[PDB]
Design a protein around this ligand. Structure first.
Ligand SMILES: CC[C@@]1(O)C(=O)OCc2c1cc1n(c2=O)Cc2cc3c(CN(C)C)c(O)ccc3nc2-1
Ligand SMILES: Nc1ncnc2c1ncn2[C@@H]1O[C@H](COP(=O)(O)OP(=O)(O)OP(=O)(O)O)[C@@H](O)[C@H]1O
Ligand SMILES: Nc1ncnc2c1ncn2[C@@H]1O[C@H](COP(=O)(O)OP(=O)(O)OP(=O)(O)O)[C@@H](O)[C@H]1O
Ligand SMILES: CC(C)CCC[C@@H](C)[C@H]1CC[C@H]2[C@@H]3CC=C4C[C@@H](O)CC[C@]4(C)[C@H]3CC[C@]12C
Ligand SMILES: CC(C)CCC[C@@H](C)[C@H]1CC[C@H]2[C@@H]3CC=C4C[C@@H](O)CC[C@]4(C)[C@H]3CC[C@]12C
Lengths: 569, 569
């Protein structure tokens, strides 16, 4: 099988050392890593799996007599403590996704289906193959079945070496025993299993083949688990009956010293033998389009399977549209036309902007899953970005603009032409895309959602002040005027005003005989636009969409560069 | 000491029964309640402590031979699974609060200080008496010390009977052993301790005096913990060595049936004896002002000790004020005066309204603590309400109005009089109070903050539409006009407009010789007000503050009635 031999490890993580001097050999079977919570057990596991940065590593990890290959992460499985499976998807769907992106595309779909069937049969999930996994807060298969599902996702590719972080934490005692019996059955086949656990039971402990006890980043013991109790008893720490030996081992460390125990081990017979053995030993699959298609498919299934959020936004949009159509019904070309028109346009623009602060959750929620799957070799950092946008961003943001315009444009009696209807729709869509893109840029590469939401809201109100309606931008002083070019709402609102007010007359029965509206009237739409600082040329309408497009590109590029330089280790 | 004898309990919680037929006697010592998670162990604990509604209870709880007194909850302590201590306060401060509200006011402060010193010495917290407890996510004393602090808060009043829900869950093994040794020391004094635990160790289990095993709402065993293993072994379920007997007992239930075990117990020698014994046995301190003072003091200390949130809001307010003063600097009485004035007033009003959706967290965050302390007899439901308002609501909402007005009123060149400055300040303060009150009304008596925040934002935008600026309320149709009287921003904005536009002239060099501004000019402020639908009489300014005050009263009363009828059991 495989023999993962680590020798003289020292990891320095501010320069702290969480693993000091750890050497051992993990032969095939069911190997273990025990110790207190603060001990470097998960850290050692990651070090052996190469899921940790090589910066601090100061030792030689050597598998089956040769240095670790570059494709080790891809050829070896790793199971997370908290399952990352997609609740909205069916078990077989998740297994199909993993098979699609990990296994070679040369394999035909029939062969992959056979492989998935084999794995499902082995884990014993055949009954619940076609059932939704569930969020573990939402209803679905049981927690043990979710854990089995994760194990299967990693088992698709026939891994020789398999790592497991806390396989039994949060599971019930019966479920935990079931999981570990399953792992023992897997190990009898020759697959080397390496895992870390917390507070095991003697029924569990009786199944181990090797034991690695860690405390405060030091090696208290490495050897067969059966002989560990004899070793400690020989050291003088006698054990009482009806006491789980694992608890006794932890108790010795707790003191109910550490360097003394480490030296005792160094003088053991299990250390010189291990030294002799170690001295003897020492001296992308898939194309870009495939990744994009599958990640987009998974995202769309997640969107449909959990429709509570999207449906609510659609409902709110429709209700607001029907209310606004009734309130502003029958806009008139009289003294009060200007106020109502400007007000409705302002409201639509700001509603499109402030409703886009819900895009911060697009990447924040799925951060751990993204990191795990990138390290495991599922996909590139580009395909994830493009697919997630194409699935979760384009349609949701493209809908509200269409709904609003179709509902309100003819109830309100706005311009009766077709050239203007689609300009309005396009303008609103671009505003929404730009605002959502700015949200992604700020919120990308973060795990906390609160701060990003606060920042987004503050920035948007500051932008909204510098829109035309509230301040008359021609009045603002020079040393603060330039801030208006950094406003998303300004461009959209200006475009809508240019589209609507060009041609209207708001003076009933002027008769223009004296030709004098008293110069303080605002009798015509063009006069209002010029007094507001807007340009009546056609370029004045499109120099706003140009800016919105450029802002979209800039923000999306920033978000990509933030995901690409994120720390994934 | 005390002998809490329960007999023939049946609790029906939709009519489900989670406790079927449970009888037992809990003599002085260190008694226990074990079983699986789904078993009614916490439910039984609450039933014995009277923290559960008497509706479902169908049995006789009898303490020391007499029915439970009405003041039982006050004379008996109860410790929650998740500690509710205030992190922002020092240990001694929390103990002082509990002593102030639980112990009689007749006791002098010197005696109470001596009592607190005794308790601190007993628990062994003397070293960390003057250290902040911490949130357990923020730095502070260790988790074990927080648990000891809770135990002390309950131990202030010298309870004869003491209840503990999961005293050791989340604690480290060494810390758990320390806590339980402390409880054993307390029990040797004659105090009857009753507690529920999960997955104990044999070191812990060796300390028990009585055992009560529950599974699926049925009594598997009640008797001395020492004899339990012999009982089960006699039943045929032999036990292996190096296995914790608690785990063996749970394993028997897991099956690695229940009615069979219950019948076996009914035929036991520990059941007839208990029946014989049971048959033998059967056949506000403080004034309102004190409560208000102390709850307000605690709230203020919590506000100062965690200043990250308040400081940020103050900073945002100041920054916005200084930006707005620069943008709108030197308002002129010309064609563009009306727009800028109306815009700034609108912005200030809506900023005061939308910034008050952060008040939903005032009561949502401290819901569990409020319920626990009300049931324990700390305070009334009125004193908590008034004190929490007086501490957390009045100052925070009263500051921003003052800051905004003082900064901007003279930079913008608004009315140069004093009568108007304070009208503006008062108007803004009332708007903020009314909006925050409406937030409290909706969010009161809830544990989830998301839904309330969404509702608040939606209601506020709907209100903002019906303000004067965007819609010209004189245009709206009759069957929808009446919705304007339910708008908080409308009243404030109308008041500010009435205060500012009354007397201004926005037509430079009219010369009024022909006396014709063309009737479409809006040459004067009064003309703008009347065209907007506002009343120029002085009553038109104050009929808005009257409405705001009435809304404040209505919403606060609603919130109180929602807290008073909340389910606390
Ligand atoms: C339109 C008034 C105002 O622009 C202002 O000038 O003062 C401050 C402020 C405003 C609007 C909004 N907010 C504010 O703080 C928060 C907010 C949330 C909104 C939401 C909820 N977002 C947080 C996504 C909507 O769905 C639609 C419109 C929304 N409008 C606003
Ligand atoms: N990236 C890091 N930065 C700083 N300290 C770290 C980092 N990774 C580990 N450590 C430290 O190394 C020590 C070991 O932590 P460790 O990972 O082993 O926790 P664990 O409880 O044993 O893991 P698990 O519960 O998942 O099995 C800790 O003190 C931890 O703070
Ligand atoms: N107010 C309630 N409404 C509905 N069901 C309830 C209520 N209180 C308890 N139950 C039910 O009674 C059963 C027992 O739950 P229980 O309180 O004992 O959980 P527990 O794990 O044992 O408590 P703990 O962990 O804190 O020690 C559960 O099925 C629970 O859903
Ligand atoms: C760099 C980051 C922070 C994003 C900021 C980009 C902003 C400031 C840039 C991006 C593209 C720019 C626009 C590009 C084209 C023109 C047309 C010109 O006739 C007027 C200015 C205008 C309208 C620019 C204004 C500033 C602008 C909107
Ligand atoms: C239960 C909730 C919705 C409370 C909101 C109640 C509102 C609708 C009530 C409370 C007090 C009321 C005001 C009381 C006094 C007057 C003066 C009168 O000359 C005009 C109406 C006006 C201004 C009322 C309008 C409606 C009003 C503001």
């Amino acid at each position: 099988g495989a023999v993962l031999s680590f020798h003289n490890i020292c990891y320095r993580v501010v320069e702290k050392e969480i693993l000091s001097n750890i050497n051992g050999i993990m032969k095939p079977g069911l190997n273990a890593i025990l110790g207190p919570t603060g001990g470097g057990k998960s850290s050692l596991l990651d070090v052996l799996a190469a899921r940790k940065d090589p910066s601090g590593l100061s030792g030689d990890v050597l598998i089956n007599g040769a240095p670790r290959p570059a494709n080790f992460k891809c050829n070896s499985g790793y199971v997370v403590q908290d399952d990352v499976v997609m609740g909205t998807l069916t078990v077989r769907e998740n297994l199909q996704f993993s098979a699609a992106l990990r296994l070679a595309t040369t394999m035909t779909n029939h062969e992959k289906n056979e492989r998935i069937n084999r794995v499902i049969q082995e884990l014993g999930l055949d009954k619940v193959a076609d059932s939704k996994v569930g969020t573990q807060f939402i209803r679905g298969v049981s927690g043990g079945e979710r854990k089995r599902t994760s194990i299967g996702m990693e088992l698709i590719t026939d891994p020789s070496i398999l790592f497991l972080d806390e396989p039994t934490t949060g599971l019930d005692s019966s479920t935990a025993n079931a999981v570990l019996l399953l792992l023992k059955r897997m190990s009898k086949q020759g697959r080397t299993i390496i895992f870390s656990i917390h507070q095991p039971r003697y029924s569990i402990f009786k199944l181990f083949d090797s034991l690695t006890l860690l405390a405060s980043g030091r090696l208290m013991f490495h050897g067969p688990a059966q002989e560990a109790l004899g070793y400690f008893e020989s050291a003088g720490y006698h054990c009482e009956a009806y006491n789980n030996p694992a608890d006794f081992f932890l108790d010795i460390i707790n003191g109910d010293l550490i360097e003394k125990l480490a030296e005792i081990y160094v003088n053991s017979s299990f250390y010189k033998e291990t030294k002799a053995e170690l001295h003897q030993l020492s001296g992308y699959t898939t194309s870009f389009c495939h990744q994009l298609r599958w990640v987009s498919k998974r995202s769309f299934k997640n969107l449909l399977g959990n429709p509570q959020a999207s449906i609510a936004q659609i409902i709110v949009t429709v209700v607001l549209g029907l209310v606004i159509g009734a309130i502003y019904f029958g806009l008139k070309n009289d003294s009060t036309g200007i106020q109502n028109r400007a007000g409705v346009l302002f409201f639509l623009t700001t509603n499109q902007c402030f409703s886009s602060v819900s895009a911060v959750e697009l990447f924040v929620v799925e951060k751990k899953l993204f990191i795990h799957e990138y390290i495991s070799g599922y996909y590139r950092v580009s395909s994830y970005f493009l697919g997630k946008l194409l699935s979760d961003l384009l349609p949701m943001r493209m809908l509200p603009s269409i709904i609003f315009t179709c509902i309100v444009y003819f109830m309100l009696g706005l311009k009766p032409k077709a050239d203007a209807f689609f300009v309005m729709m396009f303008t609103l869509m671009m505003v929404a895309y730009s605002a959502s893109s700015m949200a992604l840029a700020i919120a990308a590469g973060q795990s906390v959602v609160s701060v990003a939401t606060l920042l987004m809201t503050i920035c948007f109100v500051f932008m909204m002040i510098f829109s035309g309606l509230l301040v008359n931008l021609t009045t603002i002083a020079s040393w603060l005027s330039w801030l208006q070019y950094f406003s998303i709402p300004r461009y959209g609102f200006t475009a809508l005003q240019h589209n609507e007010f060009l041609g209207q007359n708001f003076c009933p029965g002027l008769n223009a005989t004296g030709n004098n509206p008293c110069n303080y009237a605002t009798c015509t739409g063009e006069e209002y636009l010029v007094k507001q600082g807007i340009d009546l040329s056609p370029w004045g309408l499109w120099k706003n969409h140009v800016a919105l497009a450029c802002m979209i590109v800039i923000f999306l590029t920033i978000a990509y560069l933030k995901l690409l330089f994120l720390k994934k280790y």
